[PDB]
Design a protein around this ligand. Sequence first.
Ligand SMILES: OCC1(c2ccc(-c3cc4nc(O[C@@H]5CO[C@H]6[C@@H]5OC[C@H]6O)[nH]c4cc3Cl)cc2)CC1
Ligand SMILES: Nc1ncnc2c1ncn2[C@@H]1O[C@H](COP(=O)(O)OP(=O)(O)O)[C@@H](O)[C@H]1O
Ligand SMILES: Nc1ncnc2c1ncn2[C@@H]1O[C@H](COP(=O)(O)O)[C@@H](O)[C@H]1O
Ligand SMILES: Nc1ncnc2c1ncn2[C@@H]1O[C@H](COP(=O)(O)O)[C@@H](O)[C@H]1O
Ligand SMILES: [Cl-]
Ligand SMILES: [Cl-]
Ligand SMILES: [Cl-]
Lengths: 289, 369, 159
Amino acid sequence: SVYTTFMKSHRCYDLIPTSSKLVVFDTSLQVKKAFFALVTNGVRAAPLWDSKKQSFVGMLTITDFINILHRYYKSALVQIYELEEHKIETWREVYLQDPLVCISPNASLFDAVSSLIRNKIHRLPVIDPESGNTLYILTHKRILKFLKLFITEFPKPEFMSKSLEELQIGTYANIAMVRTTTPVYVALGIFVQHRVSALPVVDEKGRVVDIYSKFDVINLAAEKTYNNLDVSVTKALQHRGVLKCYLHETLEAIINRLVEAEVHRLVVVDEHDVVKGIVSLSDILQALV
Amino acid sequence: GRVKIGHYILGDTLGVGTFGKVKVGKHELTGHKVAVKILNRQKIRSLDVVGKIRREIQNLKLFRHPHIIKLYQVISTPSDIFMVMEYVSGGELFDYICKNGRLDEKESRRLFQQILSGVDYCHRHMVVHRDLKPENVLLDAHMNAKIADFGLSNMMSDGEFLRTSCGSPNYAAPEVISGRLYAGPEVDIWSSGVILYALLCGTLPFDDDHVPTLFKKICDGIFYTPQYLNPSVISLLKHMLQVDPMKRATIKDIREHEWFKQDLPKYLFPEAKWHLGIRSQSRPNDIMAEVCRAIKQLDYEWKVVNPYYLRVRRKNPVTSTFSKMSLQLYQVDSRTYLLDFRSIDDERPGSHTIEFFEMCANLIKILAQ
Amino acid sequence: ARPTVFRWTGGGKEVYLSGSFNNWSKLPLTRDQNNFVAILDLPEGEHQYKFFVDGQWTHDPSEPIVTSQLGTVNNIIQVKKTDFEVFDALMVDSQKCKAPPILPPHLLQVILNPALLPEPNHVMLNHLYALSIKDGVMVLSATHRYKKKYVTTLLYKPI
Ligand SMILES: OCC1(c2ccc(-c3cc4nc(O[C@@H]5CO[C@H]6[C@@H]5OC[C@H]6O)[nH]c4cc3Cl)cc2)CC1
Ligand SMILES: Nc1ncnc2c1ncn2[C@@H]1O[C@H](COP(=O)(O)OP(=O)(O)O)[C@@H](O)[C@H]1O
Ligand SMILES: Nc1ncnc2c1ncn2[C@@H]1O[C@H](COP(=O)(O)O)[C@@H](O)[C@H]1O
Ligand SMILES: Nc1ncnc2c1ncn2[C@@H]1O[C@H](COP(=O)(O)O)[C@@H](O)[C@H]1O
Ligand SMILES: [Cl-]
Ligand SMILES: [Cl-]
Ligand SMILES: [Cl-]
């Protein structure tokens, strides 16, 4: 593979921006304050510092919110005590009862892509070993953006010309979906038992109307509405056009589509606009490594 | 009966710079001419410029700009240090403006571009040549500007300001004459501003035999613009000779100016409220007394450099790695003061930046405002 | 050999340098002002020299002397290895030898007030900036540089 050689050569540092912002939480910080700080800072992931251990113990992401929110939701008439009064350490001790993954800026973008899939994670902290400081959080979206800048300037191979059906890339079976009527608590249930980024919203018939993502869950913390999870998936999405691909659309064309609108995953819809499959940024980078 | 160094016959003393004698040098066989900066070792060690000379050589050896005098080679002897440099026949730009008048808009601009380009090259290499005057701008056979004498120059370090109130009063910045702290590039801009004036007018913008009125006029940023001066350059000079360093033009802002950009040659250039530290209102001595009482109540070894500057180090309980930081007290107003916490970059561990935060957060949770 | 400098500081009509290095032959020194010089190459090691300043044989008192077993007082010079390389010589030379400042306005200028921030002035790097303690939690910040890229780390720590 010619794209795999491009990655195995380029340093992680090159992908790091000119001037980044990094939010680090002490593990002693109350978990609600943590999720609010993510929202206020406009960041989707935060390294966690155990002052007692004097090292970065892990990452706090929207999945942590999804997990507390579903493990502990009693009803809309009674407070999620655990979410309110609990430290990041108190909740991590529960959730992770039964380690930290990181790339060095000296490591190659391929090592980074491998490490992402190898551990099945979306957020990878780039840490300089000399300093021990976390520099940046390498995402799929960013790697895919950089690989797209070169894919365009460099020639088009056989795979790029081939379709998504022919090349056979992504998940097209056991597709976890929510419906219009489905409440947020149930959608959160799916996110836990299935471990997938977004849930396509379907009408009376199996046609995709919207797509409820792990990101739209960040909004509950933003609007301070997480106390009412009984609300439907559609009601929850009223705070903010759908993007779908066809099985006969080129892999290079869909690669430009995912990067052009800067989306995390494309839905494989058939001629009658019904959900037939799914293709994520994670799968695209895997297929290319 | 010829006195040689390298293979050059030492000749007439061209001048005496900040630290040494400068003499001409004519190559034994080729006739090539150099400017030889002689520095007596015994004399340089008599002042404490031994480190300053080390850095000066270091910088000048790694530079190569068409408007900065080239340092060819340094020849050490037991006696003295000889700095073989490029020689320009034209001499001082200052003397040029004396003999001939002021330069025409077009000719002035040319030279101003050349100078600034070099001033930029220095800054682009963390060097701030303070003492930038037409007396230090040399000219070659083909009338090209050549920045010379880095005696008073200094390095720019991440997080630190310079103090030295160096250079002539006429070309000096108001903050420099005021002896305040400064970043570095801004004072070179002020100097470059008076050079542009000197080029277009043939006189100095800030000048007086009554030195008190000289400094008043410098600090009031007030100068005379002759009727012959083009508004576009008066605009540039007004933006360059700002008494406020924060309101002053950058090499970036100048590169963007309409008068500058005009006929500018290709080769010359490439291409929720946060608070700084804590602010105690108490007596400056009593405030630093509290940071000592506190630095001790936290059990951290320090070093008192100034009666307002400290160089503290705390042992990591886990990693066992010694981490360093610096504290400085600054006067914000007449009634209020501020304690500035700066990280000291050392030389596998935990995390330098986070450790620095936890270090600070302690000396704060036991301190004023 | 290494270039050694011989300089007679003082007045004179005719000034010569006799030395071990030239079999004590009178070498004329060229004068600039009150400094008569010669730059001769000498091997690393001990050398003895004297001056013939206007009909009188002398030595530079400011320089190291040696008195002979015969009562000959000549100047001496140990030309050391470290004298030839500039950075070795400047290293050996380095070894041989209020009111509170007014706050620079550069420090009051920030990059903080999505993830992408403006390039900061080098002077504010490594400085501590903190946000007011709202709800028993202090927020700390600082911009550091790693190679040619910059990172502004925010620590959320309860107090
Ligand atoms: O061209 C005339 C001519 C000629 C060439 C050169 C020198 C000469 C002068 C020196 N003055 C010295 O030191 C004094 C003290 O410290 C001060 C100052 O100069 C350096 C500065 O730091 N070291 C010197 C070395 C030499 Cl070779 C003299 C005459 C051939 C006869
Ligand atoms: N590098 C990492 N080291 C340790 N835990 C991690 C790391 N990255 C993510 N996690 C954990 O994995 C879980 C799922 O995270 P993730 O898939 O990255 O979510 P998101 O799609 O919002 O980025 C979370 O509970 C988070 O704490
Ligand atoms: N709704 C979904 N149902 C089933 N699999 C999915 C769904 N969304 C994404 N996937 C797959 O889950 C894996 C990880 O995806 P992602 O979390 O989107 O990065 C990939 O193999 C996707 O194809
Ligand atoms: N296929 C899609 N079409 C349209 N919007 C989408 C799609 N997938 C995700 N989004 C939107 O993108 C956000 C989710 O962000 P993220 O998980 O970072 O990709 C939400 O606002 C979704 O509505
Ligand atoms: Cl002079
Ligand atoms: Cl010339
Ligand atoms: Cl003049």
